[PDB]
Amino acid sequence: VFNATRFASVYAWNRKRISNCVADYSVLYNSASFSTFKCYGVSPTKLNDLCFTNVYADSFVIRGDEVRQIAPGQTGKIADYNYKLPDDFTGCVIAWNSNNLDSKVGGNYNYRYRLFRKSNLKPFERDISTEIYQAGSTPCNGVQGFNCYFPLQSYGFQPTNGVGYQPYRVVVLSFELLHAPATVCGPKKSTNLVKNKCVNFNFNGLTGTGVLTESNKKFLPFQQFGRDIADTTDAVRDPQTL
Amino acid sequence: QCVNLTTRTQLPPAYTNSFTRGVYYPDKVFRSSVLHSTQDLFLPFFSNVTWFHAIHKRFDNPVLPFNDGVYFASTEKSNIIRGWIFGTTLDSKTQSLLIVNNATNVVIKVCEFQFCNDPFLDVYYHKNNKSWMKSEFRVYSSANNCTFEYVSQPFLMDLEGKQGNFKNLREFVFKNIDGYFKIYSKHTPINLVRDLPQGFSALEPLVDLPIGINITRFQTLLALHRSSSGWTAGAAAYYVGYLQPRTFLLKYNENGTITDAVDC
């Protein structure tokens, strides 16, 4: 999603649902493939330790002067008329310089933005409506004219544009933890196994201290761990190997 | 979609007796040479179940309440059971679940489904070149707003019809706990006339779906064939039961499998 060639238009911004998988943000953090990486409320190390129900990746391209306009609880051309971050947004924001890629000679019109709207959009809101913006009291009749403006507009992305006008790929990761079972989780790093020694072992969601030795017991394919007459765990099955 | 089968005949829900049926492995805990006591949703022993069947002048696809959980058992030959429909309103107004087997993979999706009055799958033109291939899909007209999708590993299902005793037996358990759908499956051959055979079997975990939706009702999908209200059904019988919070004594053998159960 971050390395994809082209995105949807900002007002059209693509909502990419990431669900039921592992999410490792330490690679992207250390990949050095981004120009700037800034998180709000949660560090990338914490994300690898948490499970989220739905992870929505908001991808789109904007001009440099418009990058500073994306923060929780702010205003601007991107915030009001396109996409706004809620005050409780816990996610991260990452950007990179695409001027050598997403910019074309004479301007790139594939990307467009909403310059005008009769009101301000709420956070996590997307409006593709083409309805003409009516500034005055004269009915616009669905067309541009006096006190009437066409709200949809195109970017001027060109390889020669200034830093402020150069296209940047902005991926806003929206993290929403709901009452439903958490699907997306971060990577949990396993360590090496040691046997025939006294150690403190943590296997999946179970912990304990004792000596681990290979036994002759056989668990059914679906049985991860056994218990004793006292309902104490006398044995376990390696989560990784069998 | 809105058309109902002409051959389908309404009949009263005859009841039959179940022996030990409804026992399953509660959890993943291994235990051997011990006797464990646990309480969970079970089918009481010597209880009464419902008797449904499908044949070329009586066909049964009624709506049944899910409640907390239910027990399903079917004696199959051509594997006439095509899946199940799970949903609250059984319409696009809410999110509905469809567990279906296309003979290739097991498709499980949670979407907004357009409900058909009498969903099924037809199969046409057997004669020579036995065919047995799905053609018409009456399960749903359209789907959208999908929050879940799952597909099992490829497999080859034999839909060819058989004669004599029923060669296939599928006993499943369906329940919802803390937004987690639990499915327990068992398959063993039997020699049966009617009702249910007397014996013990322990169901094993099949899949775990963290869907987290409410199911107040369900249907049983069936396959129809003819050589869409004029289709016919093959001879088959399936069963349904309601689970209750009963305590059983699960006797574990040296290998870890349950030898027998005792209803408190």
Q: Do B180 and A229 touch (CB under 8 A)?
A: no
Numbers of helices and strands, H then E, in chain B: 0, 19
Minimal-distance CA residue of chain B relative to A217: B255
Tell me which residue in A180, A224, A226 faces B212 most closely, judged by beta carbons: A180
Q: Judged by CB atoms within 8 Å, which residues 26-45 of B form the interface with A?
A: 28-32, 34
Tokens of A110: 């594939």
Q: Do A220 and B34 touch (CB under 8 A)?
A: no
Q: Is A52:A175 a contact under the CB 8 Å cutoff? A: yes
For tokens 């209750």, what's the residue?
B244
Q: Is A224 on the interface with B (CB under 8 A)?
A: yes
Show Cβ contacts of residue B165 under 8 Å, excluding neighbours closer than 6 positions: B191, B192
Pairing of strands B236-242, B48-54: antiparallel
At residue B180, φ and ψ (nearest 5 deg) are -120, 115
Question: Rounded to the nearest 5 degrees, what angle is found at the Cα of B42, between the Cα atoms of B36 and B44?
Answer: 100
What ranges in chain B are assigned the alpha helix state H?
none
Query: Count of CB atoms within 10 A of residue A189's CB?
Result: 6
Report the C-alpha gap between A47 and A37 in whole angstroms: 14
Q: Do A222 and B204 touch (CB under 8 A)?
A: yes
Q: Do B29 and A223 touch (CB under 8 A)?
A: yes
Q: Do A226 and B29 touch (CB under 8 A)?
A: yes
Q: Judged by CB atoms within 8 Å, which residues 121-180 of A form the interface with B?
A: 179-180
Q: Do B256 and A181 touch (CB under 8 A)?
A: no
Q: Do B30 and A180 touch (CB under 8 A)?
A: no
Q: Do B30 and A183 touch (CB under 8 A)?
A: no
Measured in angstroms, the CA of B26 and the nearest CA of chain A are apart by 11
Q: Is B136 on the interface with A (CB under 8 A)?
A: no
Short-list B94, B214, B77, B249, CA closest to B157: B77
Q: Output the DSSP codes for B88-123.
A: SSSSTTS-EEEEEE-SSSEEEEEEEEEEPSS--EEE
Residue B44 DSSP class = -
Q: Output the DSSP codes for A149-177.
A: E--EEE----TTS-GGGSEEEEEEEEEE-
Q: Is B230 on the interface with A (CB under 8 A)?
A: no
Structural domains in chain B? 15-264 (2.60.120.960)
Method: cryo-EM
